[PDB]
Amino acid sequence: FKRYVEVGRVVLVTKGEYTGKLAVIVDIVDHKRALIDSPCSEFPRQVIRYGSVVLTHIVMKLPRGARSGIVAKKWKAQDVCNKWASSAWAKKLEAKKVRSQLNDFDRFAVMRLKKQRREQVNVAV
């Protein structure tokens, strides 16, 4: 295996108003609930269910039950921000996010862009 529910593991929220936000499991409440925290102020420390988050491959060295300030300090020290972005998974999510807030004029420019991209179809025989 590569994803284990352990203290300090980074998770991505999939259900709820915090969908798409990154968090770190500060404690294991039980088999079905865990306490998470995030350095972002808009994300408050809260108890969430595992069914609402996906376990990411990133694990940070964080002591059990660390407060919000300690979690943020550990998060900055271990640069989990841009460590998650280094993965192609994050790039796809951001590329998906950028695309969805595109508008009609941008979509028009994209088709011209990708058709200029496609006009080559030049491969050595």
Binding site: R3, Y4, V5, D27, I28, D30, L35
Partner: protein, 168 residues
């Protein structure tokens, strides 16, 4: 959604008892109306205090002082079964006393098919020391190196094109 309610009440003052004893109970109910009803039920069954003769002097919801601190709660209850006379003790690990009681009610109705009215919570305590924990599943939670793969994952847009990963 249950709520913890401090209900203090006493019988109406009279010449025989100008200063009636004030009795307080910490009891859980969805709303204040249910809590005051449950308080009267317990008071009648213990002190034989009639509802008409009594009055509710204070009702206050009690929030969790540390809702962000994981705890273990031990609950003593008077289980009502086919024989209608049984005592049980259970331990639940969570961050709120209300949550533990909600898990207690769901568990009992699940395992023993006991309704809300049949169940009466006798006492709820917070087991802070790991040693007093009596339950093996709880003790396995308090182990220092707790780590396990996520179980029961399972995951309109019908007709998916590819097969689900259902893994890492």
């Amino acid at each position: 959604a249950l709520k913890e309610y401090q209900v203090v009440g006493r019988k109406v003052p009279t010449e025989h008892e100008p200063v009636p004893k004030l009795f307080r109970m910490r009891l859980f109910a969805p709303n204040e109306s249910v809590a005051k009803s449950r308080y009267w039920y317990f008071l009648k069954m213990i002190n034989k205090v009639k509802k008409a003769t009594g009055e509710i002097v204070a009702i206050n919801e009690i929030s969790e002082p540390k809702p962000l601190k994981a705890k273990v709660f031990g609950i003593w209850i008077r289980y009502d079964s086919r024989s209608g006379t049984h005592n049980m003790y259970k331990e639940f690990r969570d961050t709120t006393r209300v949550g533990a009681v909600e898990a207690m009610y769901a568990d009992m109705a699940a395992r023993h098919r006991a309704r809300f009215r049949s169940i009466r919570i006798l006492k709820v305590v917070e087991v802070e020391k790991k040693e007093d924990v009596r339950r093996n599943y709880v003790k396995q939670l308090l182990n220092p190196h707790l780590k396990f793969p996520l179980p029961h994952r399972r995951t309109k847009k019908v007709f998916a094109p590819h097969r689900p990963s259902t893994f890492y």
